[PDB]
C-alpha cells in the first residue's frame, strides 16, 4: 500500500545532492496496458547522473522519477495486458523510473524472462547498447583490430566478448590487475592497466599500424588518443565520455580544433550512438542476448557490491554508494541494486 | 625540345611566394609503359596550395612538380603502352605534375576521353570526389535532405547534381545571387546566398528537423552550421575545409570542444574522405560520370576566366592568376586554364 523510492528534488550531477529517498509514497496502479513490476534488481548506469542533471529534458523542473531498468515479477496489470502477461511473471524492462519498490511499465515494453535473475537485467541496457551498436555501426570482419575503454565495466564486457565472437583481435583497458585478469578470461587478446601501462606507448609499439574500430565510454585524453590510433578507415563509435559527466557542463575536453583534419587524412569517422534511436533493433538483440546469456556462451558479469567496504548493494539507500563506486572505477561487470 | 613548367622551389601556402615559373625545361620522354602528354587543359584545385605548402609528403623538399590534373594529346609513348593507346589520341589523367607544357603519364592511370575539352577535365578530381564520396558514405535515397557548402564551385556542382539524380532534396551554399541562379539550373531546391542570407537560420527555419548528409568542403564557421543542422542518424562528410587552407597550419577555427556530445545526442557521424584512399572505385566513377557527361545528362561547368579581370586564363603564367581568382570565391563551376597550341 506504501512504498519507498528515489526523486529527483534538485538538478545536479552530484547525485547525493540531487536525489532523495521517499519513505511514505502511494504504490501506482497500472492502467489497462501497463504491468505493475515488484522491482528485486535495478541497474546503476553511468548516465544516472545526466538524468538527475536535468540533461535529457531541460525543460522538465524537480521533481520527477530516476533509474532507467528494472528485473522483478508482475504484481498487478490492466486487462489488454493480461493477453500475453500474467501475475508472478518474471519480467525486465528498460524505462525511467525503476529506482522504486515497484514501477508501472507499458507491457508493450516489458521484456519477458525466465526467472529473476541479475545476469538477465545486464543485458537490458549495458548487453543491447554494445550488440546493436557494434551490428549497426562496427563493420566487423574476422581480424579487425577493436579498442574497448572501460572494457572490465557493465557494457565494456559485452562491447569484449562480441569482438570476440566476431573473430576480432581485441584490446581493453581497465584500472587494475584484477580487472586485467577478468579481460584476459574474457579472451581479451590485450589487457591494458592503465595505472601501470600508459595505453598511448602500448598502441604506438604493439599496433604501429592503428586500430579498425574503437567502442568509446571514456572521453578526454582516452578519445585523443584512439583517434590518433586510428587506422586508414577506421571507426571510433562514442558510446558515452563518462570522464566529463561529474562537471558542471558534463562535458570532457578533447583535442577537437584538428579533428576534422585527422579524419579527412585516415578517410576515418567518428559516429555518435543513443540507444534510443535504434528501439526498432531492441527486441532482436535482447532474444539474442538471452539465449546467449542462458546457453552459457556469454559471461554476464553482476558486481552486487559484495567486496565493497559497506558490503552487498541492497536497498535503494544502496543507490548512492553504489553510483560512488562506479564514479571510483571500483566495479567488474554490472553495478546491480537488490531490493529484498 | 625546352618547355615551361611550374616548380614548388619554397614550402608555402601563399602560391605565388612558393611557385616558381622554370622557361629552360628539357621535355621528358616516355618509358615502356609511359605516355608523353601535351597538355592542352589543366585543373586548378584548392590543395594545390596545400601541396605548395608540403602538407602531403612532409618529408619531400622542394624542387618537385605540381598539378593535379590535365587533358592532351599523345604526342609520344612506349612500345608496350602503344598496345592501347596511339600517338594523337586524346587522354585525361590524375598524376601530380599537369602543371607543364609536357606530362610523362604511366599508360595505366590515363583515361582515353572522345576529345580534347575542359568539361572532360572536369570529371577527374571533381567528379569523382563527389561520387564516389556519396556513393560510398552518404547512403542517399528518395527524400533525403542533402546539404552540399562551396555548391557552385568545382565539386559541389557534381555533389549538387549527384544528390538531385538519387532524388534527394538538395540545399546548395554560395557567395552571389549569379552562383544561386546557376545552383536553380542544376535543380537545387534552396540556394542560399551566405553573404546575404543567415545559413543557420534559414537551416533552423526551413529545415527543423535538420538534413541527413552534407557535403562540407568549406570549414571553421561552415562547419561548426553545419554539425548543428544535422538530423538524427545524419552524416557529415569532411570533403575539405579550404577556409583554413591559406593559414600557417592549413586547419580553420571550430567550435567543436561539444562535438562529440552532438554526435551522441543525435546518433550522428562525421566522416573523412580522401580520393587516394578510394582508388578502387575510381574507373567504375569515371566511366559514369563520361557516359553523363557525353550524354548532356550532367552539366560539367568550365571557368577558363573569360569574366575575370584579366580575361582568359591562358598559360601556364595564368595559374597564380586562376588560383587568386578561387581563394577571392569568384568561380563559378571548375577553374580550368588553357596552354593553346
Ligand atoms: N550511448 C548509449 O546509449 C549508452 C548506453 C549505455 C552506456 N553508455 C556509456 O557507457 C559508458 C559506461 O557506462 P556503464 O553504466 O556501463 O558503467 P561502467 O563501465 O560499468 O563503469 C564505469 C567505468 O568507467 C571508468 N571510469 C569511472 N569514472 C571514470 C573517470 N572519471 N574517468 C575515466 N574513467 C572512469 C571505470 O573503469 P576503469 O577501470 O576502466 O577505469 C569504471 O568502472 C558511459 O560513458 C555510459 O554513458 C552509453
Ligand atoms: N577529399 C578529397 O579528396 C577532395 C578532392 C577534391 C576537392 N576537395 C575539396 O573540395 C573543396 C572545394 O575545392 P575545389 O578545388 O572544388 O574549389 P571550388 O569549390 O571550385 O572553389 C572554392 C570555392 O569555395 C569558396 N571559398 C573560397 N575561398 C573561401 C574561403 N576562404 N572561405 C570560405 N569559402 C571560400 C568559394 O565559393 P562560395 O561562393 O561558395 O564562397 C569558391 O568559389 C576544397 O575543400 C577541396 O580541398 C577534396
Ligand atoms: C552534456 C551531456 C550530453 C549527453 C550526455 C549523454 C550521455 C548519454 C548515455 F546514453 F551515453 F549514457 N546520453 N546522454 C544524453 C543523450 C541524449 C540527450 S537528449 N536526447 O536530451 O539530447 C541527453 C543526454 C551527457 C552529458
Ligand atoms: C593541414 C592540412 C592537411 C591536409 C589537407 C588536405 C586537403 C585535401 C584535399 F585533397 F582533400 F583537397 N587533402 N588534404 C590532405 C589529405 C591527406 C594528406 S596525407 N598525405 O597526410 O594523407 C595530405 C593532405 C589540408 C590541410
Do not use: W
Request: charged residues 20%; hydrophobic residues 40%.
Amino acid at each position: 500500500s506504501m512504498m519507498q523510492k528515489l526523486v529527483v528534488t534538485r538538478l545536479s550531477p552530484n547525485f547525493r545532492e540531487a536525489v532523495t529517498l521517499s519513505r511514505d509514497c502511494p504504490v501506482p496502479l497500472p492502467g489497462d496496458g501497463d504491468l505493475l513490476v515488484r522491482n528485486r534488481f535495478v541497474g546503476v548506469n553511468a548516465s544516472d547522473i545526466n538524468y538527475s542533471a536535468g540533461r535529457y529534458d531541460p525543460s522538465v523542473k524537480p521533481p520527477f522519477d530516476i533509474g532507467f531498468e528494472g528485473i522483478g515479477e508482475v504484481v498487478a496489470l490492466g486487462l489488454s495486458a493480461s493477453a500475453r502477461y500474467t501475475v508472478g511473471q518474471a519480467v525486465a524492462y528498460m524505462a525511467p523510473g525503476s529506482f522504486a519498490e515497484y514501477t508501472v511499465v507499458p507491457a508493450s515494453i516489458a521484456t519477458p524472462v525466465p526467472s529473476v535473475k541479475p545476469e538477465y537485467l545486464t543485458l537490458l541496457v549495458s548487453g543491447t547498447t554494445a550488440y546493436i551498436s557494434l551490428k549497426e555501426l562496427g563493420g566487423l570482419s574476422e581480424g579487425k583490430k577493436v579498442l574497448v575503454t572501460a572494457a572490465a565495466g557493465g557494457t565494456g564486457q559485452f562491447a569484449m566478448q562480441l569482438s570476440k565472437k566476431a573473430k576480432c583481435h581485441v584490446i581493453g583497458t581497465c584500472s587494475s590487475d584484477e580487472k586485467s585478469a577478468f579481460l584476459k578470461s574474457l579472451g581479451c587478446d590485450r589487457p591494458i592497466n592503465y595505472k601501470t601501462e600508459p595505453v598511448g606507448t602500448v598502441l604506438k609499439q604493439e599496433y604501429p599500424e592503428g586500430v579498425d574500430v574503437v567502442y568509446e565510454s571514456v572521453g578526454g585524453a582516452m578519445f585523443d588518443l584512439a583517434v590518433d590510433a586510428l587506422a586508414t578507415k577506421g571507426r571510433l563509435i562514442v558510446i558515452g565520455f563518462i570522464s566529463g559527466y561529474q562537471t558542471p557542463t558534463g562535458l570532457s575536453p578533447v583535442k577537437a580544433g584538428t579533428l576534422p583534419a585527422k579524419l579527412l587524412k585516415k578517410s576515418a569517422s567518428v559516429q555518435g550512438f543513443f540507444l534510443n534511436h535504434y528501439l526498432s533493433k531492441y527486441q532482436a538483440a535482447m532474444s539474442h542476448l538471452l539465449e546467449m546469456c542462458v546457453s552459457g556462451d556469454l559471461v554476464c558479469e553482476v558486481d552486487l557490491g559484495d567486496l565493497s567496504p559497506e558490503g552487498r548493494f541492497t536497498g535503494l539507500e544502496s543507490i548512492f554508494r553504489a553510483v560512488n563506486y562506479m564514479y571510483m572505477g571500483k566495479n567488474t561487470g554490472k553495478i546491480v541494486v537488490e531490493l529484498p
